[PDB]
Design an enzyme around this catalytic site. Structure first.
Site, PDB file in Angstrom:
ATOM      1  N   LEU A  17      -9.197 -33.250 -33.442  1.00 13.61           N
ATOM      2  CA  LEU A  17      -9.620 -32.479 -32.275  1.00 13.61           C
ATOM      3  C   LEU A  17      -9.676 -30.980 -32.547  1.00 13.61           C
ATOM      4  O   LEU A  17     -10.444 -30.269 -31.891  1.00 13.61           O
ATOM      5  CB  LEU A  17      -8.682 -32.746 -31.080  1.00 13.61           C
ATOM      6  CG  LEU A  17      -8.660 -34.140 -30.434  1.00 13.61           C
ATOM      7  CD1 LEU A  17      -7.529 -34.288 -29.407  1.00 13.61           C
ATOM      8  CD2 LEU A  17      -9.998 -34.495 -29.789  1.00 13.61           C
ATOM      9  N   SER A  19      -8.054 -27.537 -35.440  1.00 16.24           N
ATOM     10  CA  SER A  19      -7.133 -26.988 -36.419  1.00 16.24           C
ATOM     11  C   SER A  19      -6.797 -25.561 -36.017  1.00 16.24           C
ATOM     12  O   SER A  19      -7.577 -24.886 -35.340  1.00 16.24           O
ATOM     13  CB  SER A  19      -7.726 -27.002 -37.830  1.00 16.24           C
ATOM     14  OG  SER A  19      -8.955 -26.294 -37.860  1.00 16.24           O
ATOM     15  N   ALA A  21      -3.669 -22.100 -37.004  1.00 17.12           N
ATOM     16  CA  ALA A  21      -2.839 -21.499 -38.036  1.00 17.12           C
ATOM     17  C   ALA A  21      -1.633 -22.361 -38.380  1.00 17.12           C
ATOM     18  O   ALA A  21      -1.045 -22.180 -39.451  1.00 17.12           O
ATOM     19  CB  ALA A  21      -2.389 -20.099 -37.602  1.00 17.12           C
ATOM     20  N   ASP A 133       3.283 -16.623 -29.415  1.00 16.84           N
ATOM     21  CA  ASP A 133       1.853 -16.856 -29.632  1.00 16.84           C
ATOM     22  C   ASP A 133       1.136 -17.283 -28.349  1.00 16.84           C
ATOM     23  O   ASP A 133       0.255 -18.149 -28.372  1.00 16.84           O
ATOM     24  CB  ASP A 133       1.645 -17.893 -30.738  1.00 16.84           C
ATOM     25  CG  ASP A 133       0.196 -17.991 -31.182  1.00 16.84           C
ATOM     26  OD1 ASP A 133      -0.551 -17.010 -31.006  1.00 16.84           O
ATOM     27  OD2 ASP A 133      -0.192 -19.062 -31.674  1.00 16.84           O
ATOM     28  N   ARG A 137      -5.956 -19.988 -26.049  1.00 19.37           N
ATOM     29  CA  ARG A 137      -6.077 -21.170 -26.893  1.00 19.37           C
ATOM     30  C   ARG A 137      -4.816 -22.027 -26.868  1.00 19.37           C
ATOM     31  O   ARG A 137      -4.870 -23.199 -27.265  1.00 19.37           O
ATOM     32  CB  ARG A 137      -6.371 -20.757 -28.338  1.00 19.37           C
ATOM     33  CG  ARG A 137      -5.328 -19.832 -28.913  1.00 19.37           C
ATOM     34  CD  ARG A 137      -5.664 -19.396 -30.348  1.00 19.37           C
ATOM     35  NE  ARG A 137      -4.562 -18.625 -30.914  1.00 19.37           N
ATOM     36  CZ  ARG A 137      -4.429 -17.307 -30.801  1.00 19.37           C
ATOM     37  NH1 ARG A 137      -5.337 -16.587 -30.151  1.00 19.37           N
ATOM     38  NH2 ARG A 137      -3.376 -16.714 -31.334  1.00 19.37           N
ATOM     39  N   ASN A 138      -3.687 -21.473 -26.417  1.00 15.89           N
ATOM     40  CA  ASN A 138      -2.439 -22.226 -26.318  1.00 15.89           C
ATOM     41  C   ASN A 138      -2.078 -22.562 -24.875  1.00 15.89           C
ATOM     42  O   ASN A 138      -0.921 -22.890 -24.592  1.00 15.89           O
ATOM     43  CB  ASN A 138      -1.291 -21.466 -26.988  1.00 15.89           C
ATOM     44  CG  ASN A 138      -1.449 -21.411 -28.488  1.00 15.89           C
ATOM     45  OD1 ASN A 138      -1.964 -22.348 -29.074  1.00 15.89           O
ATOM     46  ND2 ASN A 138      -1.040 -20.315 -29.111  1.00 15.89           N
ATOM     47  N   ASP A 151       3.211 -24.999 -27.386  1.00 15.52           N
ATOM     48  CA  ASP A 151       3.464 -24.446 -28.721  1.00 15.52           C
ATOM     49  C   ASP A 151       4.373 -23.225 -28.736  1.00 15.52           C
ATOM     50  O   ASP A 151       4.355 -22.446 -29.698  1.00 15.52           O
ATOM     51  CB  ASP A 151       2.152 -24.123 -29.443  1.00 15.52           C
ATOM     52  CG  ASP A 151       1.450 -25.366 -29.905  1.00 15.52           C
ATOM     53  OD1 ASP A 151       1.963 -26.465 -29.595  1.00 15.52           O
ATOM     54  OD2 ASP A 151       0.412 -25.249 -30.587  1.00 15.52           O
TER      55      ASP A 151
HETATM   56  C1  LIG Z   1      -2.730 -25.097 -30.070  1.00 11.01           C
HETATM   57  S1  LIG Z   1      -4.050 -26.344 -30.157  1.00 11.01           S
HETATM   58  C2  LIG Z   1      -3.438 -27.915 -29.512  1.00 11.01           C
HETATM   59  N1  LIG Z   1      -2.255 -28.457 -29.827  1.00 11.01           N
HETATM   60  C3  LIG Z   1      -2.166 -29.599 -29.189  1.00 11.01           C
HETATM   61  C4  LIG Z   1      -0.934 -30.472 -29.307  1.00 11.01           C
HETATM   62  C5  LIG Z   1      -0.889 -31.970 -29.594  1.00 11.01           C
HETATM   63  C6  LIG Z   1       0.465 -32.667 -29.689  1.00 11.01           C
HETATM   64  C7  LIG Z   1       1.756 -31.877 -29.500  1.00 11.01           C
HETATM   65  C8  LIG Z   1       1.658 -30.380 -29.236  1.00 11.01           C
HETATM   66  N2  LIG Z   1       2.747 -29.481 -28.992  1.00 11.01           N
HETATM   67  C9  LIG Z   1       4.110 -29.877 -28.873  1.00 11.01           C
HETATM   68  O1  LIG Z   1       4.474 -31.001 -28.951  1.00 11.01           O
HETATM   69  C10 LIG Z   1       5.006 -28.716 -28.537  1.00 11.01           C
HETATM   70  C11 LIG Z   1       5.344 -28.665 -27.071  1.00 11.01           C
HETATM   71  F1  LIG Z   1       4.850 -29.681 -26.297  1.00 11.01           F
HETATM   72  C12 LIG Z   1       6.215 -27.535 -26.565  1.00 11.01           C
HETATM   73  C13 LIG Z   1       6.699 -26.473 -27.546  1.00 11.01           C
HETATM   74  C14 LIG Z   1       6.334 -26.513 -29.015  1.00 11.01           C
HETATM   75  O2  LIG Z   1       6.791 -25.514 -29.879  1.00 11.01           O
HETATM   76  C15 LIG Z   1       5.458 -27.654 -29.507  1.00 11.01           C
HETATM   77  C16 LIG Z   1       5.058 -27.750 -30.961  1.00 11.01           C
HETATM   78  N3  LIG Z   1       6.226 -27.997 -31.784  1.00 11.01           N
HETATM   79  C17 LIG Z   1       6.693 -27.082 -32.865  1.00 11.01           C
HETATM   80  O3  LIG Z   1       6.191 -26.054 -33.157  1.00 11.01           O
HETATM   81  C18 LIG Z   1       7.928 -27.699 -33.515  1.00 11.01           C
HETATM   82  C19 LIG Z   1       8.826 -27.200 -34.676  1.00 11.01           C
HETATM   83  C20 LIG Z   1      10.018 -28.047 -35.116  1.00 11.01           C
HETATM   84  C21 LIG Z   1      10.309 -29.374 -34.420  1.00 11.01           C
HETATM   85  C22 LIG Z   1       9.406 -29.843 -33.282  1.00 11.01           C
HETATM   86  C23 LIG Z   1       8.204 -28.979 -32.832  1.00 11.01           C
HETATM   87  C24 LIG Z   1       7.144 -29.178 -31.741  1.00 11.01           C
HETATM   88  O4  LIG Z   1       7.051 -30.108 -31.005  1.00 11.01           O
HETATM   89  C25 LIG Z   1       0.329 -29.694 -29.119  1.00 11.01           C
HETATM   90  C26 LIG Z   1      -3.295 -29.754 -28.452  1.00 11.01           C
HETATM   91  C27 LIG Z   1      -3.650 -30.871 -27.517  1.00 11.01           C
HETATM   92  C28 LIG Z   1      -2.565 -31.640 -26.856  1.00 11.01           C
HETATM   93  C29 LIG Z   1      -2.952 -32.723 -25.891  1.00 11.01           C
HETATM   94  N4  LIG Z   1      -4.377 -32.989 -25.630  1.00 11.01           N
HETATM   95  C30 LIG Z   1      -5.454 -32.217 -26.263  1.00 11.01           C
HETATM   96  N5  LIG Z   1      -6.815 -32.547 -25.916  1.00 11.01           N
HETATM   97  C31 LIG Z   1      -7.992 -31.945 -26.518  1.00 11.01           C
HETATM   98  C32 LIG Z   1      -9.349 -32.419 -26.021  1.00 11.01           C
HETATM   99  O5  LIG Z   1      -7.926 -31.121 -27.370  1.00 11.01           O
HETATM  100  C33 LIG Z   1      -5.081 -31.124 -27.232  1.00 11.01           C
HETATM  101  N6  LIG Z   1      -4.075 -28.717 -28.646  1.00 11.01           N
END
Ligand SMILES: CSc1nc(-c2cccc(NC(=O)c3c(F)ccc(O)c3CN3C(=O)c4ccccc4C3=O)c2)c(-c2ccnc(NC(C)=O)c2)[nH]1
Length: 292
Positions: A17, A19, A21, A133, A137-138, A151
């Site tokens: 879906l 990419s 950084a 960040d 986009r987030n 994120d």
């Molecule tokens: C920026 S782009 C982007 N990312 C995502 C995406 C996908 C799956 C999971 C996550 N994020 C987390 O799980 C999360 C969170 F919920 C809260 C805080 C957070 O820090 C994190 C990250 N995180 C870490 O850094 C990290 C470091 C160490 C241990 C554990 C962790 C850890 O969990 C994001 C999307 C997205 C999501 C759902 N549907 C779509 N649909 C379409 C059409 O695109 C796109 N889009």
């Protein structure tokens, strides 16, 4: 109980879906053990940054947030890469959404999104979680009426110069008051329908134009009241910047008279959904402020 450890054989990546950084996001499927259903999920595969146990300890934190405007980590798999699982949001991120609906978004949507982002940020501040960040986009779109921050902490545990407070650029200082700077830039992104900030200006120059007092320009749809909020988020003295709870109040006040604070052609024909369409959206996609 808030974090499910997944084995690699109970989920599959389907299509990429996006990419960024910090990694790669996939549409995936969860296949419950002993069942015949395939449940869509989102999977984030991180790039290399940590022992598995320390990563799991950070994951329990990401899984423990509880606020309607903050995404929660649902599941993790650490057998090879770090793979993070959350609910699939078919609308994607808010930056893409506003670009796709460029001059077809009413003021009620724009100001309510600002409220919702300030609310999720205020909650992260309560948990002492610095984002580092925040950007359009987030922010993920659960429905067009309901957005959610994702994120936070990803930047730390693993460089958006044009979203960063001056002190973060010059000194790598990251606080909730530097997140307020990024919030102002995020509001600017929304109000310009997804323009790139400082387009054409190299990142290495941002520190110098900031110290000269130059800021992002007033978006054409913004009254001065809205633009003053953004300017306050970009004050050099971090303690002079608004607090997230002050931003909730201010944007909530504006949302009660939206056409006074944003000037949008055809705004009268772009209100929030009727109760009928709202009930339908919530029943199908979202089972979990209006003008006066
Ligand atoms: C920026 S782009 C982007 N990312 C995502 C995406 C996908 C799956 C999971 C996550 N994020 C987390 O799980 C999360 C969170 F919920 C809260 C805080 C957070 O820090 C994190 C990250 N995180 C870490 O850094 C990290 C470091 C160490 C241990 C554990 C962790 C850890 O969990 C994001 C999307 C997205 C999501 C759902 N549907 C779509 N649909 C379409 C059409 O695109 C796109 N889009």
């Amino acid at each position: 109980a808030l974090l499910r450890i997944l084995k690699e054989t109970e989920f599959k990546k389907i299509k990429v879906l996006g990419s960024g950084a910090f990694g790669t996001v996939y549409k995936g499927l969860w296949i419950p053990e002993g069942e015949k259903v395939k449940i869509p999920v989102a999977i984030k595969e991180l790039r290399e940054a940590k022992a598995n146990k320390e990563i799991l300890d950070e994951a329990y934190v990401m899984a423990s947030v509880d606020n309607p405007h903050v995404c929660r980590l649902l599941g993790i798999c650490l057998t090879s890469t770090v793979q993070l699982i959350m609910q699939l949001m078919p609308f994607g991120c808010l930056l893409d959404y506003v670009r796709e609906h460029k001059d077809n978004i009413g003021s009620q949507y724009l100001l309510n999104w600002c409220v919702q982002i300030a609310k999720g940020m205020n909650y992260l501040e309560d948990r002492r979680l610095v984002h580092r960040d925040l950007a359009a986009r987030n922010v993920l779109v659960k429905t067009p009426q309901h957005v959610k921050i994702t994120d936070f902490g990803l930047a730390k545990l693993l460089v958006p110069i044009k979203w960063m407070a001056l002190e973060s650029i010059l000194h790598r200082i990251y606080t909730h008051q530097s997140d307020v700077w990024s919030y102002g830039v995020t509001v600017w992104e929304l109000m310009t329908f997804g323009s790139k900030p400082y387009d054409g200006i190299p990142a290495s120059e941002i520190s110098s134009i900031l110290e000269k007092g130059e800021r992002l320009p007033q978006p054409p749809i913004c009254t001065i009241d809205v633009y003053m909020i953004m300017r306050k988020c970009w004050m050099i003295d971090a303690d002079s910047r608004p607090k997230f709870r002050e931003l909730i109040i201010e944007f909530s006040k504006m949302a009660r008279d939206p056409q006074r604070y944003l000037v949008i052609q055809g705004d009268e024909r772009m209100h929030l959904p009727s109760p009928t369409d709202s009930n339908f959206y919530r029943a199908l996609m979202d089972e979990e402020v209006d003008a006066d």
